[PDB]
Amino acid sequence: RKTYTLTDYLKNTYRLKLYSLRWISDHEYLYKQENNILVFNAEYGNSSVFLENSTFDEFGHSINDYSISPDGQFILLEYNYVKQWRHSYTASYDIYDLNKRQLITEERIPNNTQWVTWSPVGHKLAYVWNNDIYVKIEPNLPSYRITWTGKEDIIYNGITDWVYEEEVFSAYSALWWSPNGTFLAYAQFNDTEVPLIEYSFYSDESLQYPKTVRVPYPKAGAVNPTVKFFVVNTDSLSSVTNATSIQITAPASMLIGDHYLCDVTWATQERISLQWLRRIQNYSVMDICDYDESSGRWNCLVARQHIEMSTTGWVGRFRPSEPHFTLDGNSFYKIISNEEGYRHICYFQIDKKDCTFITKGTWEVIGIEALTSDYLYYISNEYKGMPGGRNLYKIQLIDYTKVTCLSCELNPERCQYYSVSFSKEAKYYQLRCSGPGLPLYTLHSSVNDKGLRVLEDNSALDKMLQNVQMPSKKLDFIILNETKFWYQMILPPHFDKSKKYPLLLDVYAGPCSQKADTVFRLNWATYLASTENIIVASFDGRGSGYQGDKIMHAINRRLGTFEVEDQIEAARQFSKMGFVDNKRIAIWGWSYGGYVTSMVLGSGSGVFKCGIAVAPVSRWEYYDSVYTERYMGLPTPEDNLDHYRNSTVMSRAENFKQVEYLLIHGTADDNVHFQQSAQISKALVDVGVDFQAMWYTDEDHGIASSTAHQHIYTHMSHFIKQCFSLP
Amino acid sequence: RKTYTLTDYLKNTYRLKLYSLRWISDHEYLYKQENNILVFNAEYGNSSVFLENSTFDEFGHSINDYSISPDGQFILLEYNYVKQWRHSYTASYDIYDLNKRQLITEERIPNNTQWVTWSPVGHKLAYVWNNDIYVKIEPNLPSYRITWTGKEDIIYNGITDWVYEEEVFSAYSALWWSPNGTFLAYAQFNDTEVPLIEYSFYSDESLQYPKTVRVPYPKAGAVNPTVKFFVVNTDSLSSVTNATSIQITAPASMLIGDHYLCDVTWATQERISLQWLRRIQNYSVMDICDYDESSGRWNCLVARQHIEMSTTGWVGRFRPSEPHFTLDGNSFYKIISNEEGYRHICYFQIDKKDCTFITKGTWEVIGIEALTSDYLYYISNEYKGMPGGRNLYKIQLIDYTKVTCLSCELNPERCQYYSVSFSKEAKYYQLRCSGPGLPLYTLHSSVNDKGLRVLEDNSALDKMLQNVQMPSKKLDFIILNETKFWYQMILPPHFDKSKKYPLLLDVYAGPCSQKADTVFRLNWATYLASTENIIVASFDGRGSGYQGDKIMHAINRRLGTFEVEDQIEAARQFSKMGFVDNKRIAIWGWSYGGYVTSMVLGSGSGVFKCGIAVAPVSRWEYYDSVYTERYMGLPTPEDNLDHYRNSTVMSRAENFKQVEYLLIHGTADDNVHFQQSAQISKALVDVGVDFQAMWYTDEDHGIASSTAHQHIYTHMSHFIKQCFSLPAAASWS
Numbered sequence A: 001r002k003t004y005t006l007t008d009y010l011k012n013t014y015r016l017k018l019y020s021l022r023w024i025s026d027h028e029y030l031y032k033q034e035n036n037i038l039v040f041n042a043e044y045g046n047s048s049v050f051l052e053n054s055t056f057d058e059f060g061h062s063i064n065d066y067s068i069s070p071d072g073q074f075i076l077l078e079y080n081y082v083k084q085w086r087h088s089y090t091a092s093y094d095i096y097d098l099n100k101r102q103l104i105t106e107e108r109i110p111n112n113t114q115w116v117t118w119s120p121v122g123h124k125l126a127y128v129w130n131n132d133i134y135v136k137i138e139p140n141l142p143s144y145r146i147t148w149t150g151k152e153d154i155i156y157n158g159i160t161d162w163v164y165e166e167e168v169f170s171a172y173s174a175l176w177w178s179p180n181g182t183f184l185a186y187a188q189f190n191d192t193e194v195p196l197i198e199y200s201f202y203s204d205e206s207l208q209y210p211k212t213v214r215v216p217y218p219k220a221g222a223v224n225p226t227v228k229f230f231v232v233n234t235d236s237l238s239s240v241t242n243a244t245s246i247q248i249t250a251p252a253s254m255l256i257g258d259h260y261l262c263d264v265t266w267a268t269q270e271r272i273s274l275q276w277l278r279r280i281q282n283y284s285v286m287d288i289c290d291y292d293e294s295s296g297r298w299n300c301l302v303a304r305q306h307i308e309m310s311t312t313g314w315v316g317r318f319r320p321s322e323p324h325f326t327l328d329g330n331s332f333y334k335i336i337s338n339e340e341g342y343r344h345i346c347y348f349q350i351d352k353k354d355c356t357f358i359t360k361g362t363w364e365v366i367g368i369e370a371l372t373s374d375y376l377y378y379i380s381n382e383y384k385g386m387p388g389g390r391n392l393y394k395i396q397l398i399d400y401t402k403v404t405c406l407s408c409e410l411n412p413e414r415c416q417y418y419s420v421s422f423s424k425e426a427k428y429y430q431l432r433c434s435g436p437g438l439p440l441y442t443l444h445s446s447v448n449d450k451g452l453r454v455l456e457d458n459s460a461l462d463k464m465l466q467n468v469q470m471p472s473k474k475l476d477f478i479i480l481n482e483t484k485f486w487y488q489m490i491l492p493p494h495f496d497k498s499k500k501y502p503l504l505l506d507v508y509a510g511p512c513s514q515k516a517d518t519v520f521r522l523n524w525a526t527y528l529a530s531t532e533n534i535i536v537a538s539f540d541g542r543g544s545g546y547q548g549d550k551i552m553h554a555i556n557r558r559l560g561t562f563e564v565e566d567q568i569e570a571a572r573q574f575s576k577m578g579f580v581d582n583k584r585i586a587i588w589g590w591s592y593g594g595y596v597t598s599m600v601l602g603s604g605s606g607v608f609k610c611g612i613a614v615a616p617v618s619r620w621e622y623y624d625s626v627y628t629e630r631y632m633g634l635p636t637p638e639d640n641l642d643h644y645r646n647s648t649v650m651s652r653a654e655n656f657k658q659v660e661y662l663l664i665h666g667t668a669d670d671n672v673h674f675q676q677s678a679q680i681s682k683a684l685v686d687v688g689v690d691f692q693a694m695w696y697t698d699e700d701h702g703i704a705s706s707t708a709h710q711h712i713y714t715h716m717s718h719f720i721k722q723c724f725s726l727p
Numbered sequence B: 001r002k003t004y005t006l007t008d009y010l011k012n013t014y015r016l017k018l019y020s021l022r023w024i025s026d027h028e029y030l031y032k033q034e035n036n037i038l039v040f041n042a043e044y045g046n047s048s049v050f051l052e053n054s055t056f057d058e059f060g061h062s063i064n065d066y067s068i069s070p071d072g073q074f075i076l077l078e079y080n081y082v083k084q085w086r087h088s089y090t091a092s093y094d095i096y097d098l099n100k101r102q103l104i105t106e107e108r109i110p111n112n113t114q115w116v117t118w119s120p121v122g123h124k125l126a127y128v129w130n131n132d133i134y135v136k137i138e139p140n141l142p143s144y145r146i147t148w149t150g151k152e153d154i155i156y157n158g159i160t161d162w163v164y165e166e167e168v169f170s171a172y173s174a175l176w177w178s179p180n181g182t183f184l185a186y187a188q189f190n191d192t193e194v195p196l197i198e199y200s201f202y203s204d205e206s207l208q209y210p211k212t213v214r215v216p217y218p219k220a221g222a223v224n225p226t227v228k229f230f231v232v233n234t235d236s237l238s239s240v241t242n243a244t245s246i247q248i249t250a251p252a253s254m255l256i257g258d259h260y261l262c263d264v265t266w267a268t269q270e271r272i273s274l275q276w277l278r279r280i281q282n283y284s285v286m287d288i289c290d291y292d293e294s295s296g297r298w299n300c301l302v303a304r305q306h307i308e309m310s311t312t313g314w315v316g317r318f319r320p321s322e323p324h325f326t327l328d329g330n331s332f333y334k335i336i337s338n339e340e341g342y343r344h345i346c347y348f349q350i351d352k353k354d355c356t357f358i359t360k361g362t363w364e365v366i367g368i369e370a371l372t373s374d375y376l377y378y379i380s381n382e383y384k385g386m387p388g389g390r391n392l393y394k395i396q397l398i399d400y401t402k403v404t405c406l407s408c409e410l411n412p413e414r415c416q417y418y419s420v421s422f423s424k425e426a427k428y429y430q431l432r433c434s435g436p437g438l439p440l441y442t443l444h445s446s447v448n449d450k451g452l453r454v455l456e457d458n459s460a461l462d463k464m465l466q467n468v469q470m471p472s473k474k475l476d477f478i479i480l481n482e483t484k485f486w487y488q489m490i491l492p493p494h495f496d497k498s499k500k501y502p503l504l505l506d507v508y509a510g511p512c513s514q515k516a517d518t519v520f521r522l523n524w525a526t527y528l529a530s531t532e533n534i535i536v537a538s539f540d541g542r543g544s545g546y547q548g549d550k551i552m553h554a555i556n557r558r559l560g561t562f563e564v565e566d567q568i569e570a571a572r573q574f575s576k577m578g579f580v581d582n583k584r585i586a587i588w589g590w591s592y593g594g595y596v597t598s599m600v601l602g603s604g605s606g607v608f609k610c611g612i613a614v615a616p617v618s619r620w621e622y623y624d625s626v627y628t629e630r631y632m633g634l635p636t637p638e639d640n641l642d643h644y645r646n647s648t649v650m651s652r653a654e655n656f657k658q659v660e661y662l663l664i665h666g667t668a669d670d671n672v673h674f675q676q677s678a679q680i681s682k683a684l685v686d687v688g689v690d691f692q693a694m695w696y697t698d699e700d701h702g703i704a705s706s707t708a709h710q711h712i713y714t715h716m717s718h719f720i721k722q723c724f725s726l727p728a729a730a731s732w733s
């Protein structure tokens, strides 16, 4: 039979089908099919046409995406999409009135809009343009300008700056409408004193002089952006006077030094919760703020303030967890690390400081998915004690013993990794199984957790794959110091335990990482195992996630230590299996995985023949403040400078004489600056180590343009094949 | 015996000895021996200690260089040397008083000084600091500030900006003392509207944020720096008033558009000559300017202007040639292209337009070396009709048929490439033979051209090389369309014409290049031939120099055409030789050679298996104005934009699917910007062509730091060895 080839991976010959729906009520969803939008009844599965694929035939611009107002009266059409960072972009927008069949031609959303969002009910709009916020009460009416301080690279109103986008909110938006749309809350970031990262951008060959891109980016220990928080009442805006925004100040325990705003969650129409985190990220404070109708102000009583602190590490997996408030806003549920270091759901009353744990065990809650009047729905890795599996559960709010696993037993051999999408009030849910078998999308009723129908079963892909020699995936563990450490192996087709195969260790190994799981993927590793007969392994050692704080916090203040040592130990635990050729063990990774690959190659272990680091971190002082300091503290003599200096790739340069190394980096990487690889290469040159390199002109951290993506995987495939003597 | 290995090349195991002397008079020279400065009598060869080595250790810092004042009373000590571009650098300076035997610690030359020079007689000093000129009449006295307009990256007084340093003066200095030191002439450059090239500099790993280096650099067709010229009388400076600089303006034939100052040559104590060149570099004017006692100004008589133009190309090899004035300053000798396109010596009278050629023939004068009342001494490649040879000749000024070759027959098997250093009034001359045998330094007296003695014969190196399997060099020619084109081959030891060797074509091929010559070199090619048994060949095709304008101007307005085609043709001719393996032909080059290598690899010729381009030009609009426009004109639709767009490496990307390519570039290259290779790689990625790359962090055009130099040659050696199917060798660590 044929194999899954590199061209198959690069050209997406074998496509995974999805079933992306958008819930519009508690009983119906929208589903885009053949460019027309259908509305489905969840109970019976019948549909009607919501919006025909011919409606916008005469539009004149290619439509990137759409957003229907929650009341179904209008549609926002996004076009002229121009990417910025991981989440940010600018675009043009048109509004179409679905009842009148008219495009709005006056008081339009401006071109180069940075963010736009409908209110959660009705059809108000808030948007950010030139770093200032604007509100439109009706699509055909003029905008009210909320802020006047917006300034490129300095003041950001309602949008995040680079570090808050990448490391805190995972979004460009910094706008939060209240549940019924009365209030619009927003953050303001000030990057005045934040230093700029500067790099060249070459552009098309017609550009005679390269451009210098300058981005406010705080490296570890550098001056950070400051933040303020405001709430404006959108129902009391005037065309005559400027809008009044009410500031909600951070608590005094945060104002004493540098801090961050880390979560914004509306609890009710008149109550908002804010979480603040100290720059030393082991202390966080949640304020619960209530609107005072008599003064028009927002007050956060200390009686409703909650503290979260960590004595062994930082707070949260990547940040303090989100609270899930009951409808009345008087209580909330939140994931918290318990006394044994396992993250479980805690129930809080707003004015009581000790929470009650509602789940427990040597496993963790991954996320809270829905909170109804009677049940809380959550995803965990409890099932079979497998940290790399995910299943949906529900728990009765009045009786914590009444737990039901909703997905564990549906299709246990095919499906061990689920996510979920609930309807507006959770009467229905779509389950999305991503492995170990082919992804499966099903619809269920929460009335008694009964299956309704299969939405997408990937039968088309299954038929195409029957003709292909596909690899298999093994998920198991090794025991070190009486602790299980999980690994996965992508095994070549017709795998023979008596034979010896080359092995490639695919590594991430950053804090809270998980590379051993039950997910079905079609990627470069599939090609390496299917066509090249390489075993592609990954291992989750100390520092990895979802297994409790004794493992995750093992690398606290000590990156580049145990997680590096554990990848080497894993390869020792593998290299001695009679199926592993110990003369052909390689290692590769991107980003944090590039850092760990480089630290492993520089370890002098003698285990690895070769390795590839793509856009690696090389020294923690070069990476951003929020991520780096969470695990490393500050690079000062009083704090953790000694370990910052001891954990660099450059200090290990002499040991690279023992290995074949390929170092790759995009020149326009705004995230892990090209500087990091420029310092590695300089250190290798300074000690007389030969190595392979590749820069990618004008590519960023993703090296994701169509041509660059094909080129990097082609180059890396030649490198691994030469390392392993594969024809 | 052992071979000449890569480590031998990288560690300079086999060192060529030199004999660098400094003439101080018409009969004496200075020479550094065991860190001591000795003064030698040319006639007898006896020496005396001028300055003991120990003196250099009484400062507390290492001395980079020294300069003894012309009167021998002071020594200028250079330290804290910090390199800038090819020629420019800053340094600290101390002056030591040889008569008082003491360091001068008062009114010191400032730290970060950009340029310093003694007057040509006596001990005056002129220096440039913070882009302004200062003059010291006595080394321990306060300096007189000459200019007050200096401003970093904007106004340069007495020093060149980037493009004038690299492309016009081949120096950072823009100061010219008059012969007896009365006057100090200087240029002022104004870069206000010149765009900046910006690139990152990473520095030591402790630097948290990379630095952006910003240099005013005019790319082809961009706004150029403007220039002004001034002369100050240093004998009439006041401690009370500011100095009066007298401006000398360019002739109006230059002022009509963009132009350059291209030569400054003093003729007498009161006469200076200047050459100006239009931005379209086929028209130049020499002005002859006299000091006027009645006004205190400089008069450039219009009747004394000399125009030099080119109808087939640009003026001069790289710029108009320098004039050599007779003692009275009423006439001068200058190398000019004759009616047949050969560069020969012309004799001019200052007030007469037509010149008289004093030499002729199908060969060229390389340079005028000395001029006395009876003779003119010059270097040419006349001997044996070999354009890659060099010899010293003398011509009687009273009879041009009376030409004597001074070096041709001294040692014809060992010595075919000479340079010379004459004493102050040409009473003696040192001859420096650089090949084909080991370099040989000899001293001669001009009266009857008597050989006085051998100064350095490299006998120590000869003894070492007797135990090494050294390669040989063949210099010959191929005939193309009734024209001889020369080539050289570095041949492996025990060369067997019955065996098939791999061949690497080492290319420069830029306008006026010469890669086929009689010079003895110990370089990477020596290792490739000696140890790896690779033939390293070079070829001088169309556009190459020293063979007349018909060959040199063939590429006028057409870079990336005939010089590229000729390298492919040369390799075809070599590949047919039964001693070349046609399956193992590679090409490599740096700079213009990188551009040619890349154009050859993208040609689709099928001749070359692989190649390496180091810091290549990829598109002419990315390179500097002065060099680029000299050959290409302007990148405008009205001028030569079509050819600028047709001669890029990027347009040939699809053809690289047929070859193995290694692209290398330093990230801090201020000369051929990293941009050039960044656009090549992007074009190769865009067509799906695999290739090998290497960047060199913080290295410039030379990739010349000790560690980067070793690394680049090691990386290129592995690449060539793999291309040629040659074996590898393990090493302990």
Ligand SMILES: *[C@@H]1O[C@H](CO)[C@@H](O[C@@H]2O[C@H](CO)[C@@H](O[C@H]3O[C@H](CO[C@H]4O[C@H](CO)[C@@H](O)[C@H](O)[C@@H]4O)[C@@H](O)[C@H](O[C@H]4O[C@H](CO)[C@@H](O)[C@H](O)[C@@H]4O)[C@@H]3O)[C@H](O)[C@H]2NC(C)=O)[C@H](O)[C@H]1NC(C)=O
Pocket: A039, A040, A041, A044, A046, A047, A048
């Ligand atoms: C998926 O299929 C569902 C099942 O058919 C669809 O639901 C149906 O929607 C229609 C339209 O909203 C409802 O229509 C009428 O309902 C009552 C009468 O209901 C009775 O008869 C129905 C059969 O005709 C039964 O289905 C009911 O159970 C019940 O016995 C009428 O009184 C209404 O009239 C009013 O509204 C119409 C406009 O809609 C006006 O024209 C009238 O003048 C009057 O004002 C509706 O005609 C129907 O009841 C409902 N059936 C259900 C829920 O069981 C569902 O819409 C579809 N979904 C999609 C996305 O396609």
Ligand SMILES: N#Cc1c(N2CCC[C@H](N)C2)n(Cc2ccccc2)c2c(=O)n(Cc3ccnc4ccccc34)cnc12
Pocket: A166, A167, A318, A506, A507, A508, A510, A588, A589, A590, A591, A592, A593, A594, A617, A623, A627, A672
């Ligand atoms: N999601 C996510 C990830 C993350 N971050 C989440 C929080 C925000 C932070 N800026 C980035 N990093 C960590 C990281 C640390 C420092 C610098 C950059 C990124 C990594 C990472 O590293 N890998 C690994 C990873 C990323 C991409 N491809 C890979 C291919 C093979 C092996 C590993 C791979 C995978 N995912 C992430």
Ligand SMILES: N#Cc1c(N2CCC[C@H](N)C2)n(Cc2ccccc2)c2c(=O)n(Cc3ccnc4ccccc34)cnc12
Pocket: B166, B167, B318, B506, B507, B508, B510, B588, B589, B590, B591, B592, B593, B594, B617, B623, B627, B672
């Ligand atoms: N001297 C000198 C050179 C020169 N210039 C003289 C005038 C001023 C100009 N800026 C630089 N270029 C030409 C050039 C053109 C464009 C960009 C940069 C340089 C070259 C060049 O190209 N090579 C070739 C050359 C240079 C160095 N090493 C080599 C190794 C192998 C093969 C060839 C090599 C050699 N010398 C020179």
Ligand SMILES: *[C@@H]1O[C@H](CO)[C@@H](O)[C@H](O)[C@H]1NC(C)=O
Pocket: A092, A108, A109, A110, A111
């Ligand atoms: C957006 O840009 C287009 C193209 O220039 C222009 O026609 C249109 O009027 C702009 N829209 C707005 C809202 O300014």
Ligand SMILES: *[C@@H]1O[C@H](CO)[C@@H](O)[C@H](O)[C@H]1NC(C)=O
Pocket: A149, A155, A190, A191, A192, A193
């Ligand atoms: C931004 O912060 C700077 C100090 O870093 C301050 O001077 C400035 O007023 C602030 N701007 C706003 C709009 O808060």
Ligand SMILES: *[C@@H]1O[C@H](CO)[C@@H](O)[C@H](O)[C@H]1NC(C)=O
Pocket: A148, A240, A241, A242
């Ligand atoms: C609103 O504020 C802006 C910026 O301060 C100002 O220019 C404008 O005059 C204000 N408008 C009113 C009505 O006060």
Ligand SMILES: *[C@@H]1O[C@H](CO)[C@@H](O)[C@H](O)[C@H]1NC(C)=O
Pocket: A180, A181, A182, A269, A270
């Ligand atoms: C929205 O909530 C606000 C705040 O309580 C309230 O004043 C308003 O009436 C609510 N709107 C609706 C439509 O219920």
Ligand SMILES: *[C@@H]1O[C@H](CO)[C@@H](O)[C@H](O)[C@H]1NC(C)=O
Pocket: A280, A282, A309, A310, A311, A312, A633
């Ligand atoms: C937070 O971290 C700092 C730095 O490691 C430490 O000094 C402090 O005690 C920590 N707080 C807790 C509660 O552990």
Ligand SMILES: *[C@@H]1O[C@H](CO)[C@@H](O)[C@H](O)[C@H]1NC(C)=O
Pocket: A480, A481, A542, A566
């Ligand atoms: C196991 O314990 C030993 C002894 O304390 C320690 O050195 C090693 O790092 C541990 N390895 C793990 C936890 O993988």
Ligand SMILES: *[C@@H]1O[C@H](CO)[C@@H](O)[C@H](O)[C@H]1NC(C)=O
Pocket: B039, B040, B041, B044, B046, B047, B048
């Ligand atoms: C060389 O010797 C002569 C005497 O013959 C003497 O006058 C002269 O000074 C000497 N020169 C040196 C530099 O020793």
Ligand SMILES: *[C@@H]1O[C@H](CO)[C@@H](O)[C@H](O)[C@H]1NC(C)=O
Pocket: B092, B108, B109, B110, B111
């Ligand atoms: C040069 O720098 C050194 C070190 O800072 C200083 O001691 C010295 O005085 C400086 N010299 C002059 C001439 O300014």
Ligand SMILES: *[C@@H]1O[C@H](CO)[C@@H](O)[C@H](O)[C@H]1NC(C)=O
Pocket: B149, B155, B190, B191, B192, B193
């Ligand atoms: C430099 O040139 C600019 C025009 O480009 C002019 O404004 C300026 O005055 C000049 N400066 C000097 C000192 O000549």
Ligand SMILES: *[C@@H]1O[C@H](CO)[C@@H](O)[C@H](O)[C@H]1NC(C)=O
Pocket: B148, B240, B241, B242
């Ligand atoms: C010399 O020129 C400078 C700069 O224009 C000026 O500051 C200074 O006062 C002048 N000195 C005299 C003595 O005129």
Ligand SMILES: *[C@@H]1O[C@H](CO)[C@@H](O)[C@H](O)[C@H]1NC(C)=O
Pocket: B180, B181, B182, B269, B270
């Ligand atoms: C130097 O030349 C100038 C200009 O002719 C003259 O005034 C001066 O006397 C000369 N110096 C000597 C030492 O002859």
Ligand SMILES: *[C@@H]1O[C@H](CO)[C@@H](O)[C@H](O)[C@H]1NC(C)=O
Pocket: B280, B282, B283, B309, B310, B311, B312, B633
């Ligand atoms: C100089 O070159 C330009 C462009 O080729 C040409 O138009 C002009 O005639 C040339 N001048 C001479 C003197 O040949």
